[PDB]
């Protein structure tokens with residue numbers, strides 16, 4: 001019966017698909033409820049500023065303002081952005097799949113080489129990230145070999161301590177790879193604390209919106225700043241990969257628990273109705 | 277012997293790190309050599325267009341002109357169309373726009389053309405990403421499994437008609453990988469690129485570039501399917517959703533294959549360096 005396992009697979013995939021669609025719907029409702037008011041409050045103010053500059057300076061016509069805005073929009077397509085270090089940063093955003101998009105190619109050959117460069121570099125950087133994660137995991141394994149010997153002899157017994165080990169992992173990881181770089185970014189980039197943490201998360205998840213980019217403004221930066229951010233990205237991508245995998249394992253455990261809890265509720269309602 | 281394998285591991289990691297740094301250097305040089313000239317030729321023309329209107333109206337405070345451009349750029353980051361002949365505008369956080377945004381979040385594509393401005397929006401975005409990326413990983417693994425089983429049903433038909441006389445076991449896997457790459461580039465790259473070229477108005481190279489940047493989850497945001505205010509068949513965007521799901525699975529498989537090819541090439545080059553050393557001109 002080869003088809004039966006395919007049917008089980010399709011049912012599991014359909015359930016996960018429905019869960020993902022429902023997750024997207026809930027997220028859409030929440031994001032709309034959070035962003036619609038500010039969107040309206042800024043769209044009214046920009047229309048106010050338009051007539052504000054029409055009335056504060058009668059020297060500008062109504063017709064020449066639209067041509068000015070047209071040229072400004074023509075200029076936003078271009079934005080040095082392709083100097084020595086800018087293209088290095090761009091190749092980094094490409095092979096890491098972060099893709100901030102603040103710098104993107106406009107030449108046809110630029111796009112062709114970007115396609116080839118991504119297709120070849122994403123796996124290579126994957127190898128590098130796997131190696132870095134292995135090294136970091138062996139370091140943290142020496143650390144847990146030190147921690148699970150001083151507390152493994154007295155009060156708490158096992159099976160429950162694997163959770164404590166994961167807790168120590170998450171805590172020190174949020175300290176080293178999130179909190180400290182967030183403070184450094186808050187002080188150097190001029191971002192807020194929430195903005196810094198938001199940038200850290202959007203970058204280390206490889207989402208990379210591009211609204212916040214470390215080194216992106218035209219601020220003077222110390223010679224060690226951007227390379228240290230490179231190193232932080234290297235190690236933090238490994239850390240966040242580990243964290244996302246752990247969250248996935250937790251979701252797996254929760255899914256099994258919820259399947260058997262649905263079984264429990266059904267098995268109770270059944271023999272409860274049968275008591276006539 | 278944990279220390280011996282750890283030392284071998286660190287040596288391999290350092291070699292891969294040097295290779296990656298060299299790859300980045302070469303990429304940087306190529307990208308600047310390709311994009312700097314047009315950048316300069318456009319900055320000179322933008323300064324020309326600047327000075328044409330800078331002096332044509334001396335009655336403007338001229339400093340507030342640059343500050344106005346500053347304000348316009350600060351407001352364009354959210355999505356504005358400040359025109360007088362079209363004062364009515366379309367929303368970027370409506371029912372389906374935020375749906376598309378959540379999609380870009382959990383897939384880590386992150387086009388960023390529309391991004392949250394509220395503080396609570398950013399906090400919920402962090403939580404939403406941290407919870408959704410693994411869930412979507414499960415979904416993508418399931419879709420890849422389904423696609424692989426369909427490909428297995430196809431190869432069960434194909435790998436029996438070509439079983440002639442001299443047939444080897446390992447050499448037909450090459451034909452399987454070839455047919456895989458061909459049919460995948462047809463279904464997940466070529467056909468959606470044609471559809472995007474005709475519907476979005478993009479060029480062929482722009483359409484293929486968008487497909488590649490999106491299915492690799494890079495997501496610059498310069499090209500977004502469904503992003504303009506045209507009309508769309510209403511049957512367009514859900515088909516793009518399905519294409520993104522299956523093409524993300526396909527591209528994960530293809531990138532893994534490219535990694536395996538890189539492994540083989542690295543082994544061949546390591547042993548070729550060994551051979552070159554052992555020969556070293558007679």
Ligand SMILES: CS(=O)(=O)Nc1ccc(C(=O)NCc2ccc(Cl)cc2Cl)cc1
Nearest residue numbers: 081086089092093214215216226229230
């Ligand atoms: C206006 S600009 O954007 O053209 N200027 C630059 C901006 C940033 C950087 C840079 O190296 N930042 C650290 C870094 C390293 C690797 C990765 Cl993947 C991401 C990041 Cl943020 C360089 C130039």
Ligand SMILES: CS(=O)(=O)Nc1ccc(C(=O)NCc2ccc(Cl)cc2Cl)cc1
Nearest residue numbers: 368373376379380501502503513516517
């Ligand atoms: C100016 S706007 O950006 O606000 N307008 C829109 C732009 C695009 C879409 C859309 O659904 N495209 C298909 C799609 C689906 C899921 C994912 Cl993850 C990516 C993509 Cl491209 C909707 C609205």
Ligand SMILES: CCCCCCCCCCCCCCCC
Nearest residue numbers: 107108109110112113302306310
């Ligand atoms: C106007 C058409 C442009 C076509 C693409 C031009 C750039 C081609 C990329 C050059 C690749 C060089 C590979 C070097 C390998 C070491």
Ligand SMILES: CCCCCCCCCCCCCCCC
Nearest residue numbers: 011012015016019254255258407
């Ligand atoms: C055949 C059943 C497959 C299981 C798929 C659904 C299981 C339920 C998953 C529940 C996840 C709840 C946590 C989501 C984030 C709070």
Ligand SMILES: CCCCCCCCCCCCCCCC
Nearest residue numbers: 019022023026027258259262407
């Ligand atoms: C951030 C929003 C999280 C809400 C996502 C859904 C939570 C509840 C899902 C319950 C799914 C029940 C399936 C049970 C399968 C046996």
Ligand SMILES: CCCCCCCCCCCCCCCC
Nearest residue numbers: 371372373375376513514515517
């Ligand atoms: C179902 C309540 C009204 C919804 C009206 C249209 C919602 C979807 C708009 C299309 C946005 C692209 C999403 C792809 C199809 C779900």
Ligand SMILES: CCCCCCCCCCCCCCCC
Nearest residue numbers: 112113115116119479480481484
């Ligand atoms: C005239 C329309 C077709 C011309 C443009 C087709 C795209 C150019 C080739 C696509 C990139 C080549 C993939 C190479 C992968 C190693």
Ligand SMILES: CCCCCCCCCCCCCCCC
Nearest residue numbers: 287288291292295538541542545
């Ligand atoms: C100690 C292990 C050394 C092996 C590291 C990789 C060696 C080969 C790297 C060059 C091949 C990958 C890029 C090929 C570009 C065409």
Ligand SMILES: CCCCCCCCCCCCCCCC
Nearest residue numbers: 120295298299302303545546549
């Ligand atoms: C498109 C970018 C091409 C980059 C090709 C990198 C070539 C450098 C390979 C380095 C070979 C090192 C061999 C070491 C053997 C122990």
Ligand SMILES: CCCCCCCCCC
Nearest residue numbers: 010011012014015016018
């Ligand atoms: C989604 C269809 C799969 C059937 C098995 C799961 C029962 C329904 C769960 C929602």
Ligand SMILES: [K+]
Nearest residue numbers: 096097206493
């Ligand atoms: K990835």
Ligand SMILES: [K+]
Nearest residue numbers: 098207385494
């Ligand atoms: K991305």
Ligand SMILES: [K+]
Nearest residue numbers: 100101209388
């Ligand atoms: K982006």
Ligand SMILES: [K+]
Nearest residue numbers: 097206384493
């Ligand atoms: K990504």
Ligand SMILES: [K+]
Nearest residue numbers: 099208386495
């Ligand atoms: K991105």
Ligand SMILES: [K+]
Nearest residue numbers: 101389496497
């Ligand atoms: K963008």
